[PDB]
Design a protein around this ligand. Sequence first.
Ligand SMILES: CC[C@H](C)[C@H](N)C(=O)N[C@@H](CCCC[NH3+])C(=O)O
Ligand SMILES: [Ca+2]
Ligand SMILES: [Ca+2]
Ligand SMILES: [Ca+2]
Ligand SMILES: [Zn+2]
Length: 316
Amino acid sequence: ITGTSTVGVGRGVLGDQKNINTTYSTYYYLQDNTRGNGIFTYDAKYRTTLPGSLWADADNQFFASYDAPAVDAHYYAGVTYDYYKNVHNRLSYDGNNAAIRSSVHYSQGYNNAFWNGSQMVYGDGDGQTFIPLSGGIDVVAHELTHAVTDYTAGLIYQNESGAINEAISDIFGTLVEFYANKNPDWEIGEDVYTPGISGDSLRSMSDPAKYGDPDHYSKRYTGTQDNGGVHINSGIINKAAYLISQGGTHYGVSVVGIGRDKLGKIFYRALTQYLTPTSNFSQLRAAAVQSATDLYGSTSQEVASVKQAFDAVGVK
Ligand SMILES: CC[C@H](C)[C@H](N)C(=O)N[C@@H](CCCC[NH3+])C(=O)O
Ligand SMILES: [Ca+2]
Ligand SMILES: [Ca+2]
Ligand SMILES: [Ca+2]
Ligand SMILES: [Zn+2]
């Protein structure tokens, strides 16, 4: 909508107060004009018609329970835009400041979130498995990173390329969580998963097997469930990424960690310069080796650690 840029205040899903960029024209809308061609947040009103209505508020105060998922979807999309711009010199998901659109209150009791090819979509959860899923910065950044991947490598959402697609969303969703720096971790979705259970998450990058996901190529899923295991086999790549950043010894293979910034540069380069729609795990290793060689040199520690990490998870 056409109007003047404003600053509202509200509370997110976990009860934290934050300022949000709005636009005033009769109502205050969740329209952030400060980032690219805008960040726009919509109310799906418990239905599945998308996007729904651009979020309108009478007084620019967003403290209602019903407001919270919108506050977080809007705010965390801004954090994720800032990460890509500040850390990787990428302007929105398409690299040309595309508008970032999110809908909250999707369906009833919907225990998931997704990128639909055009926008982000967040369920409210059923209050047992999940609370509103935009409450997790790693969840928001994971979904927006699907848009980045779709515009760049274009990894097909099935089998190994799909598992890479999912791992890249977990890797950057985690790196965005560290960028914002509010008790960040290497776990996925801990802030919105199982409110009645302390300390768990949907997936773990540090130990995928904690939640039954494979942490070695020899344990890869080869059936048809989950588009050939895209959320399962991601654990093999998430473990490799965790080892490149943090180091460790896994199945007797030692990896020297090179830290999160270098992990992010190597994988952002692989995603944007080397991976293709059909890349498999072996081709990801080659892409990450070539990216680290470009950035640091063929005989660098960073290249050595990339090879060490893929060797540790059984990817040749
Ligand atoms: C990043 C977390 C987000 C929920 C994402 N869409 C996801 O990983 N979803 C998978 C896990 C199950 C979600 C709850 N039913 C999925 O299999 O869709
Ligand atoms: Ca209000
Ligand atoms: Ca996390
Ligand atoms: Ca929990
Ligand atoms: Zn995903």
